[PDB]
Amino acid sequence: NLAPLPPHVPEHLVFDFDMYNPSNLSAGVQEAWAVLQESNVPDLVWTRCNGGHWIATRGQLIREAYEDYRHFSSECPFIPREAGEAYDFIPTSMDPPEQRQFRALANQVVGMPVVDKLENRIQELACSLIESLRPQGQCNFTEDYAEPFPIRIFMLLAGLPEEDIPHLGYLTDQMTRPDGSMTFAEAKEALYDYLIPIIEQRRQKPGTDAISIVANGQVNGRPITSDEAKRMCGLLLVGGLDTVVNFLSFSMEFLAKSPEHRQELIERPERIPAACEELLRRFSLVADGRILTSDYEFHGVQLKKGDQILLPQMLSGLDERENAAPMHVDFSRQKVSHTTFGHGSHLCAGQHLARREIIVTLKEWLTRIPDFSIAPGAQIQHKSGIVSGVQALPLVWDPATTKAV
Ligand code: HEM
Ligand SMILES: CC1(C)[C@@H]2CC[C@@]1(C)C(=O)C2
Ligand SMILES: [K+]
Ligand SMILES: [K+]
């Protein structure tokens, strides 16, 4: 279902990539996006899929565009257009300098000092979930660990009841990987209708949870509005529920297939932080973008005002111009170059939380269950969208080779 080619786009720049269903998905989602980096494809192309939009395919262009918010605005950062237009999360729907005072409040609530404060709980929950699974000799990693570990920590941080998880998980899925049951607008409104009473309750009687802090914070000398707090909390929910969850499945699926990579981390745990970076590169999973604020010529290509451009955070680290043998996982890379948490002013606010969750998962899983694999015959399906993911991940192991700590 292609949209008619706009008159300003030359035919040689056409490449009909569908970000929500790439043709190569059976081979792995990162591999499916990497077709955009074969020699037949220009640096910057127009797809007629999903309403019609640009895609930058090279790390250099993606970084440049994310830096230049003057031409590439966050006002409409999602494809398709209806989703980008409905999208009003704070601070991600704002350009500098407006984004600034909000970014600082996001940092207050999900930044380093909060992570450092919650580290014990993070550690506690990983060990608990893992020990609980360990003697089973099998699990569905997506539902058995990948979801509850990051999500319960986020609900803990936000002071929200775990009973609300399935509902919230549904709405977030719809926003990043639309199935078609509901528009982005409807999904957002459902999410906001959940947030609205909570925020109100918390402006009246402040707590110490992230939502209380946001809803009672200050921006530009004045109190945050109930509407702004809602737009900010909505983003935090999305980030909390649908990023690390999906990334953990990619990493664990990989580790299920490489005993030598496992042993590398088991023998020298100080390598785990670098390994985290490398897995973040190889299994990068986000792709949003920007909208053109005016007519602009960018690397020889005529862009028109209102044109959307997808700037896949996923592609920069897979670009062979940034990393040699990009599809190989090499914990010893002298520089892991990537933009997995993004680039420019909107560089992920929760990246420290995410790394902590990944680093804890790697160490605690490999300690107790050093030897595991994918269930025999099992076929792993990836899904693609604004955030790519794993449908299911059946793992198996012999409990005789596992360890309680
Ligand atoms: C592996 C995990 C994660 C990845 C790959 C990721 C990716 C990203 C990316 C690419 C952006 C920039 C989007 C843009 O430029 O439009 C972003 C922004 C953001 N993320 Fe993350 N994220 C992760 C985890 C989290 C978590 C756990 C949170 C917790 C709340 C979070 C909260 C945020 C927030 C608040 C922003 C907005 C920053 C701003 O606009 O100033 N992220 N993330
Ligand atoms: C693109 C993102 C990963 C980033 C954090 C959540 C997300 C879906 C957003 O809307 C901003
Ligand atoms: K290309
Ligand atoms: K918008």
From Swiss-Prot:
E.C. code: 1.14.15.1
Could you list this entry's UniProt keywords, alphabetically sorted: Cytoplasm, Heme, Iron, Metal-binding, Monooxygenase, Oxidoreductase
As for subcellular location, the record says: Cytoplasm
Q: Which residues bind heme?
A: 348
Tell me what reaction this enzyme catalyses: 2 reduced [2Fe-2S]-[putidaredoxin] + (1R,4R)-camphor + O2 + 2 H(+) = (1R,4R,5R)-5-hydroxycamphor + 2 oxidized [2Fe-2S]-[putidaredoxin] + H2O
Pathway(s) annotated for this protein in UniProt? Terpene metabolism; (R)-camphor degradation
Q: Which cofactor does it need?
A: heme
Q: Name one GO biological process term.
A: (+)-camphor catabolic process
Give a GO cellular-component term: cytoplasm
Q: Name one GO molecular function term.
A: iron ion binding
* InterPro entries listed in its UniProt record: Cyt_P450, Cyt_P450_B, Cyt_P450_CS, Cyt_P450_sf
The protein's job, in short, is: Involved in a camphor oxidation system.
Q: Which family does it belong to?
A: Belongs to the cytochrome P450 family.
Put simply, this protein is called Camphor 5-monooxygenase
Q: Which organism is it from?
A: Pseudomonas putida
